[PDB]
């Protein structure tokens, strides 16, 4: 997976170059500006789950306006980014991470919210590809299983530093649990699995999807050609196919079913050996989801998918 890890490093170190570009943003009024941008660049993403589709275009334009140079209403006074080169590079970073935090602390709790957040992330990525590379940067670090790559336990570094690589949320004191960590990882790739299939409707876009559905085929191929982890793999595989299996079936008619009549024969027996009966909850539901789909020859539309009824009311 050298090809993928090189591309992975590019987005990582390239986001690190962004960590260096606005270090000057790290006075009494200069602190007011930093908060005003961090504030007026993360509230809109938090309301995407709680709005009507008829109104959802308001948030898209409000993000597009603030980010394109135009002003936006934050509180009472108006905020802008024009002639604010660090504020521009600062908003793209916090915006890209807020999209991931929402997939981390909302999509984990409520799977339906992935799609209204994905379309908005997909349209902004479309108009501003730099924001999208920052979206992949944070998604990759917070969730390395979305690259995908399984970090290995290494000698010479502390254990706590290794647990963070795995994506475990740790306060300075201790590491987060595993059950709450599996939810954070699920919600993050259900969001990602929704992004690679949905497209912002309005705007009259001539070009291709920013992060197309092609990245969904390789991801499934790239995690099934490596040995599975005990509980993560069987979980993340399910909540990925449930979200993006339908869109992947239509694009690749016969090639997707060949990949699906394979996991039942080859990759499913592999998961039984590595996992004790005490934590089979991932693999057991991975089959319940298929057995229906296999005999039905169809993957249900993800529960929460956006319909036309959503865009009018």
């Amino acid at each position: 997976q050298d090809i993928t890890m090189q591309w992975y490093q590019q987005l990582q170190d390239a986001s690190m170059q962004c960590v260096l570009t606005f270090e000057g943003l790290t006075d009494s009024q200069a602190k007011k500006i930093k908060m005003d941008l961090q504030k007026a660049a993360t509230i809109p993403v938090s309301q995407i789950s709680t709005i009507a589709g008829s109104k959802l275009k308001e948030i898209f334009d409000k993000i597009h306006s603030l980010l394109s140079g135009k002003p936006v209403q934050s509180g009472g006074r108006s905020v802008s980014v024009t002639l604010n080169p660090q504020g521009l590079d600062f908003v793209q970073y916090k915006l890209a991470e807020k999209f991931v935090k929402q997939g981390e602390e909302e999509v984990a709790s409520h799977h339906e919210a992935a799609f209204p957040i994905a379309v908005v992330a997909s349209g902004i990525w479309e108009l501003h590809p730099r924001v999208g590379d920052l979206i992949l940067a944070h998604l990759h670090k917070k969730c390395p299983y979305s690259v995908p790559f399984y970090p290995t336990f290494k000698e010479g570094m502390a254990l706590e530093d290794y647990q963070r690589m795995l994506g475990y949320q740790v306060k300075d004191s201790k590491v987060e649990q595993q059950d709450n960590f599996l939810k954070r990882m699920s919600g993050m790739i259900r969001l990602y699995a929704a992004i690679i299939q949905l497209r912002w409707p309005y705007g009259n876009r001539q070009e291709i999807h920013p992060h197309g559905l092609n990245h969904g085929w390789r991801w499934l191929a790239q995690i099934l050609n490596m040995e599975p982890l005990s509980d993560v793999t069987a979980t993340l595989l399910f909540d990925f196919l449930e979200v993006c299996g339908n869109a992947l079936m239509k694009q690749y008619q016969v090639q997707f079913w060949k990949m699906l009549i394979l996991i039942k024969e080859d990759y499913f027996p592999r998961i039984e050996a590595i996992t004790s009966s005490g934590q089979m909850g991932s693999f057991i539901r991975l089959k319940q989801f298929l057995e229906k789909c296999l005999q039905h020859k169809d993957i249900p539309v993800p529960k929460g998918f956006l319909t036309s009824s959503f865009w009018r009311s």
């Binding site: 499913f268 027996p269 592999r270 998961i271 039984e272 050996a273 590595i274 089979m280 693999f283």
Partner: peptide
């Protein structure tokens, strides 16, 4: 020669190990 033994089998609907 047939001997039915419902007692100890192998779950046909669960993977191994």
């Amino acid at each position: 020669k047939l001997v039915i033994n419902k007692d100890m089998r192998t779950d046909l609907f669960s993977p191994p190990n």
